[PDB]
Automatic annotation (TrEMBL), chains A, B:
Origin species: Leeuwenhoekiella blandensis (strain CECT 7118 / CCUG 51940 / KCTC 22103 / MED217)
A GO molecular function held by the record: metal ion binding
Record-listed dATP 2 binding positions: Q46, K185, Y186, D255, Y354
Gene Ontology terms describing biological process: dGTP catabolic process
Domain HD: 59-252
Pfam families according to UniProt: HD (PF01966)
Residue numbers binding dATP 1: D30, R31, S72, R301
Binding-site residues, Mg(2+): H62, H110, D111, D247
Signal sequence range: none
Annotated dGTP binding sites: Q46, V47, R59, N155, K185, K203, D255, Y354, E363
Name of the protein: dGTP triphosphohydrolase
Keywords: Hydrolase, Metal-binding
PROSITE patterns membership: HD
InterPro entries: dGTP_triP_hydro_central_sf, dGTP_triphosphohydrolase_C, dGTPase, dGTPase-like, HD/PDEase_dom, HD_domain
Length: 431, 431
């Protein structure tokens, strides 16, 4: 039921907010814009670590583009939905801008829990507990708590950052429940690991300490259970599909364009792989009148994004009933007519950009930096009577369980930028 | 007349676009988001040069906050305007979201022409032509062209960046005429210098090479002339007042908060100067329950921004007829009840932040960097037969008049970030 999916509740509320008596979905955008975690995204790795103030993307600019594309997708889907179910507007009072606001707010914050150095950073944080110092804690934690530690993802960290309670400020940013539902793409815990081939089962979305919180949200939105066991799991919110589609479109096209502009990909491929996407709307005279690679690739990027957005809207509207029922098992991008072109673009990006020498060098350095910082924090946690551990506490982190302390350490390491992490690493070693 | 101020025309159009047959004001936001000049704002100075990846603001985050505040102001003012003039909605078909879109798009791009190192950078570029090498060109240029060169501001550079014609792409970003009108705050040329004490006469808004372009815009929007001479000048677009109010509110409050968080201002002042702004809505229990300086200053900042936004809307609605007629001479912030508090905050910021030792060091370095780069470009321009000048052209800038070439050099220097400028300066000197 769509009347329960578009909820306006906030954490710690007793009177039900109504749409007629209102806007809730724009304050979420404003609150995310003005927060420190969002501001820390300006110097976090998207693909190339330590961007050197070049023209390449960071996490912040990527999130902004995903937000624009998500607003467009949400507006179109909301128009079609309001056409399909008239009573959503004539009784409850929902307009087609609310869907755009929800998807834009969710897409702006979709990537906020990521640590420095990107995917390699998450792998390093996991390997620290798996085959490093943190291994010593394995006997002192529940299997669900250990699987949280050794398979750390930014998806759970983002939910925690968004919904963190502190003395005097309950609920953290206190976003609406619809935004939280559209933000979550893996509504399950860390065990069991990969129970099936469903798209919503690749990873997990919340930690144990936050688990209870999500239950509340999942009760309010009327999500559909899938547990059939002692481990909880729910079905996806329908707008989470749109969030994922926007994320995928943006990074797939922009990575290719950035690689072309950097000199790692020849310009010819730009027309070898993209023409079928842009052939139906390209103006040949305008394309031929341009005189630099940047203009041509920008033109192609704009046309491709438009085409993919339209196709995604059509695909979503086709399989709406299955998504509402919970039986859909793929993403909207896998039901597309240009899957071969996307696959070729991704494979070329993997061969040329992800495995380039400079990228590998930066990832190797990031492994060492993260391991050193985590080991210092953990050793200061174990013994708190020495002078050195007091100094470490004063520099890095100015009544809890062991699991809560370890989660706090992981969270505090992941709020740093690449530059701050490198500077702290050099300071620890006195260089 | 408001029907002519909200124009949807784009550069190179022959058929008049109508509001009923439509959205135009959102494509402007999307186009600015995806452009390279907007992306270069992530590493440009707001107050503290070479931010060192800290929590302090850059140009990009400042522009985002100004955009949010501008959207709020525009929505409120548009609601009241549509209440005052019913025919704006029942015949033409304008909704209260269009004003918000126009003000948000104008506020997002309000600061895009700024050079590296902020105000000191503009002063250095001017001093280069005034008392440096570029002085040699004084005899070869018209007085209006020389006053453009020696009083370079980012306001004219931003208009040029927004409306730059290139082979195969006429009109640059091709934004709507309403957005261009709301973006311009000084609709006049560089001579005469400060003819009066009007707020719209402190600086100039367009260069000579772009002058003709603005005339077209000023013809379409029905702006009111003020020349009475051979030098053209027009009255302000009414929404430019809202853009300026949002810019002022944001930087005035956030500079204070950032100085407090950095350790340059004691926390006590935070309540000595802000209470009258926040005393009517502050919750004392919530304020006392917080346990860190960051939370308290963030709470105070939010409350102050809300109060100032409401007061600005009231002030604008009071003096609407004078603004439409063109007789208003001050900003909306000078007709406020909290002018003494704002003045005290600004004076404290000047004493403590602008004149701190680190800031002065960075500005002094930026002077040398900009002078070196400009001199190299100009010398390569003068003689183009030497091997060294060919190398300089190949490194820095891979049929025009002298004035056009000098303007192009100034523009190409101002597109660089602080890091890129420093790296190029070191490369020129071989360090
Ligand atoms: N350097 C590097 N970048 C990678 C690698 N794998 C992926 N990336 C980049 C490509 C994209 O810019 C970005 C994708 O991350 P996102 O968090 O946006 O989504 P992703 O689909 O990877 O995962 P998620 O939805 O979070 O489970 O990461 C890799 O092995 N190395
Ligand atoms: N470091 C430093 N920063 C300054 C100085 N004067 C102003 N600022 C900073 C304070 C604000 O963050 C920012 C204001 O620049 P904006 O371009 O936003 O507007 P402003 O009113 O200065 O001028 P405009 O409207 O462009 O004529 O510049 C100065 O002397 N030194
Ligand atoms: Mg992600
Ligand atoms: Mg993904
Ligand atoms: Mg992403
Ligand atoms: Mg400015
Ligand atoms: Mg100003
Ligand atoms: Mg500004």
């Amino acid at each position: 039921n769509w009347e329960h999916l578009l909820s306006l509740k906030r954490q710690g509320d007793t009177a039900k907010r109504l749409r007629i008596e209102q806007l809730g979905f724009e304050v979420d955008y404003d609150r995310i814009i003005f927060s420190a975690p969002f501001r820390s995204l300006q110097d976090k790795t998207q693909v190339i670590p330590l961007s050197k103030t070049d023209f390449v993307h960071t996490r912040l600019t990527h999130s902004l583009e995903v937000s624009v594309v998500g607003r467009s997708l949400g507006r179109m889907v909301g128009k079609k939905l309001l056409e399909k179910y008239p009573h959503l507007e004539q009784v409850y009072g929902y307009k087609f801008n609310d869907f755009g606001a929800i998807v834009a707010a969710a897409a702006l914050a979709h990537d906020i829990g990521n640590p420095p150095f990107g995917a390699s950073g998450e792998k390093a944080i996991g390997e620290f507990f798996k085959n490093g110092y943190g291994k010593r804690y394995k006997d002192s934690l529940t299997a669900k708590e250990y699987q949280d530690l050794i398979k750390f993802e930014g998806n759970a960290n983002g939910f925690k950052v968004l919904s963190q309670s502190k003395p005097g400020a309950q609920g953290g940013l206190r976003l609406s429940y619809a935004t939280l539902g559209a933000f979550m793409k893996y509504p399950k815990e860390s065990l069991p690991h990969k129970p099936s081939d469903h798209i919503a089962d690749k990873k997990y979305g919340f930690f144990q300490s936050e688990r209870a919180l999500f239950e509340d949200v999942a009760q309010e939105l009327g999500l559909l259970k899938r547990s059939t066991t002692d481990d909880v799991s729910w079905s996806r919110h329908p707008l989470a599909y749109l969030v994922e589609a926007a994320d995928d479109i943006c990074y797939t096209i922009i990575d290719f364009e950035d690689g072309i502009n950097l000199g790692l990909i020849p310009e010819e491929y730009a027309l070898e792989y993209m023409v079928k996407l842009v052939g139906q709307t390209i103006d040949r005279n305008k394309y031929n009148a341009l005189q630099e690679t940047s203009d041509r690739v920008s033109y192609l990027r704009a046309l491709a994004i438009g085409t993919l957005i339209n196709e995604s809207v059509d695909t979503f509207m086709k399989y709406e009933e299955e998504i509402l029922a919970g039986t859909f098992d793929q993403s909207l991008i896998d039901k597309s007519n240009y899957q071969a072109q996307i696959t070729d673009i991704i494979n070329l990006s993997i061969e040329r950009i992800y495995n380039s020498r400079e990228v590998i060098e930066k990832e190797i350095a990031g492994y060492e930096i993260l391991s050193t910082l985590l080991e210092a924090r953990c050793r200061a946690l174990d013994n708190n009577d020495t002078h050195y551990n007091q100094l470490i506490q004063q520099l890095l982190a100015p009544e809890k369980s062991l699991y809560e302390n370890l989660i706090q350490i992981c969270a505090e390491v992941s709020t740093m930028t690449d530059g701050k992490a490198l500077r702290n690493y050099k300071k620890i070693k006195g260089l």
